[PDB]
Coordinates of C-alpha atoms and ligand atoms in Angstrom, one line a residue:
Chain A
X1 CA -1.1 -3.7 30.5
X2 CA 1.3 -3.9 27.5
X3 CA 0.4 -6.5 24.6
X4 CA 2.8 -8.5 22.7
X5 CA 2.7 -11.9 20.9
X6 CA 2.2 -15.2 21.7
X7 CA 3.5 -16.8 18.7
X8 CA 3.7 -20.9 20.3
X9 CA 0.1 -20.1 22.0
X10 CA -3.6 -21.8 20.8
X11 CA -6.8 -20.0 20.3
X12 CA -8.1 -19.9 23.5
X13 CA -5.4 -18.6 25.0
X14 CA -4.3 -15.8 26.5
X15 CA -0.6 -14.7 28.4
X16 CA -1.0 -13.5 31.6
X17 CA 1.5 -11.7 34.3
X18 CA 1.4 -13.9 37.3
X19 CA 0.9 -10.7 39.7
X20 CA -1.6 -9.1 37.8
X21 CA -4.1 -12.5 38.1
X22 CA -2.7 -12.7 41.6
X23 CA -4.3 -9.5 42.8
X24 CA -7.3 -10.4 40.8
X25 CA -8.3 -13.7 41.6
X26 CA -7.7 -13.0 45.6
X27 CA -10.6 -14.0 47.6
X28 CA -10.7 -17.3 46.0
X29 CA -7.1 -17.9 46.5
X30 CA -8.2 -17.0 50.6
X31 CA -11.4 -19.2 50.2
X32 CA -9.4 -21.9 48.8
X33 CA -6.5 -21.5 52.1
X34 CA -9.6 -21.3 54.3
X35 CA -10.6 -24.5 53.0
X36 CA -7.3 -26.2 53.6
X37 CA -6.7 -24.4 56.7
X38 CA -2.7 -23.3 56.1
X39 CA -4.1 -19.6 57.2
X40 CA -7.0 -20.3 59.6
X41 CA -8.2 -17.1 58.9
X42 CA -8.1 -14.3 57.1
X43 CA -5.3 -11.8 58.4
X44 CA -2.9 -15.2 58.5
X45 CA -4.2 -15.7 54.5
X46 CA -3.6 -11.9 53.5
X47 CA -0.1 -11.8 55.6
X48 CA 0.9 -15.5 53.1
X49 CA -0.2 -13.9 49.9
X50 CA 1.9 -10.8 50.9
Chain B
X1 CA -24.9 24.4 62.3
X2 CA -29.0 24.0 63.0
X3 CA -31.1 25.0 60.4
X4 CA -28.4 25.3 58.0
X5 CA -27.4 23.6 54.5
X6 CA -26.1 20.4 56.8
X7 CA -28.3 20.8 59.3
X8 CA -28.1 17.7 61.3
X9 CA -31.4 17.6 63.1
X10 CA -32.8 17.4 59.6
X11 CA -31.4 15.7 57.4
X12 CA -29.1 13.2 60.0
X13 CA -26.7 12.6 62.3
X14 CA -23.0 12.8 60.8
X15 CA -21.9 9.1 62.3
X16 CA -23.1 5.9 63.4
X17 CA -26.1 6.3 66.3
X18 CA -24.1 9.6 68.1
X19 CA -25.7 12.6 68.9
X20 CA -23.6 16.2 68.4
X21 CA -23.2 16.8 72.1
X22 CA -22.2 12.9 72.6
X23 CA -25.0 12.1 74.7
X24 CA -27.2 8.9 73.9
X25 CA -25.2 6.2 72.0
X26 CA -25.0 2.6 70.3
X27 CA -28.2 1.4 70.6
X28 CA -29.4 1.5 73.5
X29 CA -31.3 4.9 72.7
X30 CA -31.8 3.7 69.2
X31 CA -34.8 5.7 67.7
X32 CA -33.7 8.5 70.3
X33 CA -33.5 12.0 69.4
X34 CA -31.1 13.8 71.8
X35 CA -32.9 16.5 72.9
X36 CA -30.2 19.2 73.6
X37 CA -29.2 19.0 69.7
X38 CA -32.6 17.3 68.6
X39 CA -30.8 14.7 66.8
X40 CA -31.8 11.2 65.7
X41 CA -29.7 8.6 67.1
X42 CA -29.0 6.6 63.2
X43 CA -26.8 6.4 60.8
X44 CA -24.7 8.8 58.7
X45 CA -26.3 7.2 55.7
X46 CA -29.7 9.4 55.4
X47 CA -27.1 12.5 54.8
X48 CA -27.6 11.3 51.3
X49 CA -31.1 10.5 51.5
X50 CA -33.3 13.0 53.3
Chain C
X1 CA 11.7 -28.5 73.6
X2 CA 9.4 -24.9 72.7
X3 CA 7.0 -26.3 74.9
X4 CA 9.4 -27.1 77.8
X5 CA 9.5 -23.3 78.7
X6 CA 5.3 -22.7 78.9
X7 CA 4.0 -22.1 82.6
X8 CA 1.9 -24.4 83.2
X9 CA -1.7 -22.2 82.7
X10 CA -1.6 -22.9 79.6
X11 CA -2.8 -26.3 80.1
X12 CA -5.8 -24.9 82.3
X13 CA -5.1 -26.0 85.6
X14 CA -7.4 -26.3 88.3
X15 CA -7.6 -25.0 91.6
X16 CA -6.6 -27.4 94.0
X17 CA -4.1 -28.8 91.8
X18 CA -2.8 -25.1 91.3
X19 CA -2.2 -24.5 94.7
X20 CA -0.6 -28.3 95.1
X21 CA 2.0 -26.6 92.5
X22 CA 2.6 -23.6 94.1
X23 CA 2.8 -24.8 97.1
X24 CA 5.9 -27.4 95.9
X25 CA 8.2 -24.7 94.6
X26 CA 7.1 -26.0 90.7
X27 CA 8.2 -23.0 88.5
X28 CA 8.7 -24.3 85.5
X29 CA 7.2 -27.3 83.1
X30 CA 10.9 -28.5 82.7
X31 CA 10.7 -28.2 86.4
X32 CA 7.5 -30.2 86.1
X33 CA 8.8 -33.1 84.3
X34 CA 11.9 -33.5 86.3
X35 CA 9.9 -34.3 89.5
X36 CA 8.9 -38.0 90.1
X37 CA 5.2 -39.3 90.7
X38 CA 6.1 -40.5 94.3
X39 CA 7.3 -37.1 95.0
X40 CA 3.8 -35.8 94.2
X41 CA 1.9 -38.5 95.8
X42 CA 3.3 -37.9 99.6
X43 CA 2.9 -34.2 99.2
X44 CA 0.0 -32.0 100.6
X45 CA -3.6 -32.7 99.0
X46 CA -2.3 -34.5 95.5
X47 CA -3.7 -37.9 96.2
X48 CA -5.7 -39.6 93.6
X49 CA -7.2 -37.8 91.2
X50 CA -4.8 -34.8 90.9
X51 CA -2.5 -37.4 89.0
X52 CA -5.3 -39.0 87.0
X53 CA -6.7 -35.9 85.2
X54 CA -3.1 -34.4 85.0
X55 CA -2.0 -37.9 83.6
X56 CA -4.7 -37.4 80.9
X57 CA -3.8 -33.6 80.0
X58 CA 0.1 -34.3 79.7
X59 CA -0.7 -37.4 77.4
X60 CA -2.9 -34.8 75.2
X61 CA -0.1 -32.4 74.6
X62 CA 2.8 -34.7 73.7
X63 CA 4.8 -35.3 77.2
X64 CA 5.1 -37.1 80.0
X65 CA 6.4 -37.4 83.5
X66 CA 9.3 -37.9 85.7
X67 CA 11.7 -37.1 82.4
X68 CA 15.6 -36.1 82.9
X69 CA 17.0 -32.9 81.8
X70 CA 20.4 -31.9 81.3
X71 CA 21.7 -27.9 81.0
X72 CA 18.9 -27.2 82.9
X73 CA 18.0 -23.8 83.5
X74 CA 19.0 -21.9 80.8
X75 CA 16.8 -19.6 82.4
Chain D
X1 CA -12.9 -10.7 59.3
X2 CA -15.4 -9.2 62.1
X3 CA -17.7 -11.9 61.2
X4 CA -15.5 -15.2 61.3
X5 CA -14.2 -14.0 64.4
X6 CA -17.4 -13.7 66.2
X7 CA -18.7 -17.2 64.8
X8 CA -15.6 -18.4 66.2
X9 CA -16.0 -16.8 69.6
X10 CA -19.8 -18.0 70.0
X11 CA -18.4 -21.6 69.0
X12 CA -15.7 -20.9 71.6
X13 CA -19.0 -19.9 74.1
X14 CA -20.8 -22.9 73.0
X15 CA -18.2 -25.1 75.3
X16 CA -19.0 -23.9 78.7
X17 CA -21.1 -24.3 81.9
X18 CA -24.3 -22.5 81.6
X19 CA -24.0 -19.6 83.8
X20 CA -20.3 -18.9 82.7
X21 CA -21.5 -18.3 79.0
X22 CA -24.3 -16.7 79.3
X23 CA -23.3 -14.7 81.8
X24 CA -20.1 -13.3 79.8
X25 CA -22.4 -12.7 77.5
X26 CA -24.6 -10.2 79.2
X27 CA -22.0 -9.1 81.2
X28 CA -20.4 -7.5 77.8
X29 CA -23.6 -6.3 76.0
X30 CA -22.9 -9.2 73.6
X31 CA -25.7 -10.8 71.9
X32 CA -28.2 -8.0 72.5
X33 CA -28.4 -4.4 72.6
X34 CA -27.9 -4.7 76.8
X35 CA -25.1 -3.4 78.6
X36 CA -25.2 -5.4 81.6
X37 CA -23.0 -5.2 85.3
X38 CA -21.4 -6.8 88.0
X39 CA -24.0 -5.7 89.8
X40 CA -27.2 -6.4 87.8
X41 CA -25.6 -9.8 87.3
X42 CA -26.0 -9.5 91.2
X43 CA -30.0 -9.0 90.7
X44 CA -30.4 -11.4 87.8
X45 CA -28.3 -14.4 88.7
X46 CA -27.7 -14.1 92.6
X47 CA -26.8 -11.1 94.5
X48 CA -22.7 -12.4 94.5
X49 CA -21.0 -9.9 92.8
X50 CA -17.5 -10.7 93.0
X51 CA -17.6 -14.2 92.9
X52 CA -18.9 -13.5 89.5
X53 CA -15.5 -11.2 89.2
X54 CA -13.4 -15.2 90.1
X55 CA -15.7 -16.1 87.5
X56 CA -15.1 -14.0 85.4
X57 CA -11.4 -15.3 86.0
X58 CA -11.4 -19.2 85.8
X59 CA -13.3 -18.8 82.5
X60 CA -10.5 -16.9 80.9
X61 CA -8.5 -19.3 82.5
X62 CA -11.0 -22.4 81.0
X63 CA -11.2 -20.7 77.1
X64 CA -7.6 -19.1 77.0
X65 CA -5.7 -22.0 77.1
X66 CA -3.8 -22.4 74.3
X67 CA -5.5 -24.6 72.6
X68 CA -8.5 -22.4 71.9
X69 CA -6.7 -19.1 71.9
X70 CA -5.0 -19.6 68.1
X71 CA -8.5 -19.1 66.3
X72 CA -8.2 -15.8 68.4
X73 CA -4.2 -15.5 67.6
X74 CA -4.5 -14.0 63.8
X75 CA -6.3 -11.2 65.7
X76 CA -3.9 -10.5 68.3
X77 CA -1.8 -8.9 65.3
X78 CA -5.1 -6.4 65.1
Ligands
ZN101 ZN1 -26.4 15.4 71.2

């Protein structure tokens, strides 16, 4: 995407648009609602997330 | 078409363990090559192999 | 309740017990829970165990018998 | 998705009577590359066919029940 600054930020840091790590990080965020159970499986999971 | 550029018989059946004509299908003629056609009852995958 | 409008298969009935239902004119669970143990116990093949083992299966899902309704049907 | 379903399906299978699971099993090529029948359940099991059909039957009845049918609910929606 588009860059601008983080002028309050730390080193190790790095801004990030929610949506954007949303899509990336999926199937953890489904292994992770598999292990607490709110969607028992996987078309519940992808039907929360949406 | 047989003995052609995709020629079946040779180098595979198009889907997943069906003969052209429809004849012998999942598995239970699995190395089976339907004699009408003479096609190999497998995959699509050894389109890009043989 | 949501669960006062299920037919009863839902619970997995059993045979004999099914036709002891069917054969009382039970439609409905609220129609269940309005009827009284006694009025079981008299009627055709519902002796003992028929109100054991349904007992048991009402105390898993969260009701009881012989309840009071009001408004009822709503159909 | 195909394969937590069909875990969940052989855990619902694991539950029954003997004849009733493995018999809806073969009966539906599951498990195997058989295709079995009413009627070869007939040769195998006992010549009853459709006894095996009221079978058939009371198990949906005995795995249906909705307290086992909400692992199977997500793929109602299929
Ligand atoms: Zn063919």
């Amino acid at each position: 995407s588009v860059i601008t600054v983080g002028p309050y930020l730390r080193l190790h840091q790095c801004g990030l648009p929610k949506k954007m790590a949303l899509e990336l990080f999926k199937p953890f965020i489904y292994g992770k609602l598999e292990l607490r159970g709110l969607a028992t499986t996987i078309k519940a999971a992808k039907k929360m997330v949406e | 078409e047989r003995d052609g550029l995709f020629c079946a018989r040779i180098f595979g059946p198009v889907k997943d363990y069906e003969c052209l004509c429809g004849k012998y299908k999942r598995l239970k003629h699995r190395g089976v090559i339907c004699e009408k056609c003479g096609v190999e009852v497998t995959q699509t995958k050894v389109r890009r192999e043989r | 309740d949501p669960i006062l409008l299920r037919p009863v298969d839902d619970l997995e009935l059993t045979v004999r017990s099914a036709n002891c239902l069917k054969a009382e004119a039970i439609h409905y669970i609220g129609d269940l829970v309005q009827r009284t143990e006694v009025e079981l116990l008299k009627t055709p093949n519902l002796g003992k165990k028929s109100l054991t083992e349904i007992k048991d299966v009402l105390a898993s899902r969260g009701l009881s018998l012989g309840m009071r309704l009001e408004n009822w049907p709503p159909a | 998705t195909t394969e937590s379903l069909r875990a969940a399906t052989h855990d619902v299978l694991a539950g029954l009577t003997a004849r009733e699971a493995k018999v809806l099993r073969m009966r539906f090529g599951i498990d195997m590359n058989t295709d079995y029948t009413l009627e070869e359940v007939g040769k195998q099991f006992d010549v009853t066919r459709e006894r095996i059909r009221q079978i058939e039957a009371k198990a949906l009845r005995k795995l249906r029940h909705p307290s086992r049918s909400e692992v199977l609910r997500s793929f109602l929606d299929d």
